[PDB]
């Protein structure tokens, strides 16, 4: 059948699709990302993300872990700067107790102090693993140097805050952001009805709108990190459109016109305006993609480069110059059509998997409360037109930009030189 939606009177969104899949997936989406902290409770969302297997009012940690592993199901937590999503999946004959476990974890945690004291070492271990890939550090830093208060908060806990996060901070964060008006329960392979019954036994008691977050403010700037890596990573972004505008579609078409990462294995972005240009700056290993990250109040768009330290300068300059050409109207309609085809194929392959489909429905729910059929999107992306793309470009080319660099930065340029 099709997707089916009810908005409960306490604000909770219920979305269901019954496709008779053998494994069914049920997720719950909360507007409780890292942007809702301030300077007093930094890293609380990271410990909340890692604290999904703790003792709840209804099931202990042992009961939750052994009961999910007894049926072979999976419980995972994915977190962005805006949103958290707790997802369980398993056989249709065990999703009743899977919803019991998931809704107990979302609605009634206990946050015992010895459990979080044991979890802080796992918090330290997780941070590093996450920061192995440099692209994590550079991007994290980028958001930080490019925002003042809200989106500048890191996804991972700072080093000083480990050992300082308490049970009361987790309880305050849950009581202020895990309310029914900020939650959507999305189920693929389940009946809508059951979602509702579990949405009344749970998800209905906490029904405020919660604590409203601050508006994110752009700051500009540049933070660098000399650490002696073999490759220089550099991200240069500027403020862009937010979630809910056609200029966001223009910026997505703009990143797919510039290189959005080679499609082919070991690909060279043959027609990627950015990468193609890099040739002039250098003929050595490089990687210049476009970074677009848009959140419900603000967006970041820019270029991302990995290169040898020595050539790091002009390669960055070459990439920047290519965007300036797009800001001068130097583009062809076939290139924009290919960018639109790449963007729509990427969207369809993102929603072709079950967990990506459940995430999409989830995001749409929290964001606009409505489901937008894949088809609808296709025609809206088509709405973006050439001039629109050019426009977004000039925004980047003119908007004060931020910059996060890491590596041997002896030949990496600055913003006033860039």
């Amino acid at each position: 059948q099709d997707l089916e939606f009810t908005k409960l009177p306490n604000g909770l969104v219920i979305a269901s699709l019954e496709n008779y899949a053998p494994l069914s997936r049920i997720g719950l989406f909360v507007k409780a990302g890292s942007r809702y902290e301030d300077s007093n409770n930094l890293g609380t969302s990271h410990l909340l993300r890692l604290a999904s297997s703790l003792t709840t009012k209804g099931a202990s940690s042992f009961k939750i872990t052994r009961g999910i592993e007894a049926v072979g199901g999976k419980l995972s937590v994915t977190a962005t700067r805006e949103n958290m999503a707790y997802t369980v999946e398993g056989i249709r004959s065990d999703i009743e107790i899977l919803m019991e476990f998931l809704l107990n974890v979302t609605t009634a945690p206990e946050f015992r102090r010895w459990e979080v004291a044991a979890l802080r070492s796992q918090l330290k271990i997780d941070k590093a693993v996450a920061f192995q890939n440099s692209q994590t550090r550079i991007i994290e830093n980028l958001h930080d140097v490019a925002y003042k208060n809200a989106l500048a908060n890191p996804l991972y806990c700072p080093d000083y805050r480990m050992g300082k996060i308490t049970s009361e901070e987790l309880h305050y964060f849950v009581q202020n952001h895990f309310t029914s008006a900020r939650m959507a329960l999305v189920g693929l392979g389940v009946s809508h009805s059951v979602l509702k019954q579990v949405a009344e036994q749970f998800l209905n008691m906490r029904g405020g709108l919660g604590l409203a977050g601050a508006k994110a403010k752009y700051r500009g700037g540049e933070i660098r990190e000399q650490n002696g890596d073999n490759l220089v990573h550099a991200a240069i972004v500027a403020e862009s459109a937010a979630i809910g505008n056609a200029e966001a579609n223009a910026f997505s078409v703009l990143q797919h016109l510039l290189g959005a990462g080679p499609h082919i294995k070991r690909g060279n972005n043959t027609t990627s305006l950015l990468s193609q240009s890099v040739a002039k700056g250098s003929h050595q290993p490089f990687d210049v993609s476009a970074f677009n990250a848009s959140y419900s109040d603000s967006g970041l768009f820019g270029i991302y480069t990995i290169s040898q330290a020595a050539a790091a300068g002009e390669v960055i300059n070459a990439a920047y110059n290519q965007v300036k050409a797009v800001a001068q109207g130097n583009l062809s309609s076939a290139d924009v059509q290919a960018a639109k085809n790449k963007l729509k194929a990427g969207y369809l392959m993102s929603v072709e998997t079950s967990e990506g489909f459940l995430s999409e429905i989830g995001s749409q729910a929290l964001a606009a409360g409505s489901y937008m059929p894949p088809s609808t999107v296709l025609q809206q992306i088509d709405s973006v037109a050439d001039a629109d793309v050019v426009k977004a470009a000039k925004k980047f080319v003119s908007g004060k930009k931020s910059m996060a660099a890491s590596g041997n930065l002896g030949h990496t340029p600055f913003l006033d030189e860039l």
Partner: peptide, 28 residues
């Protein structure tokens, strides 16, 4: 220190992921 258990450039925002299952990582 050892990064517990020890190149594609990010072009999209990051999303941490952890849970009961043993795997845990981040994607752009």
């Amino acid at each position: 220190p050892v990064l517990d258990v020890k190149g594609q450039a990010a072009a999209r925002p990051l999303v941490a992921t952890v849970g009961l299952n043993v795997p845990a990582s981040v994607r752009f």
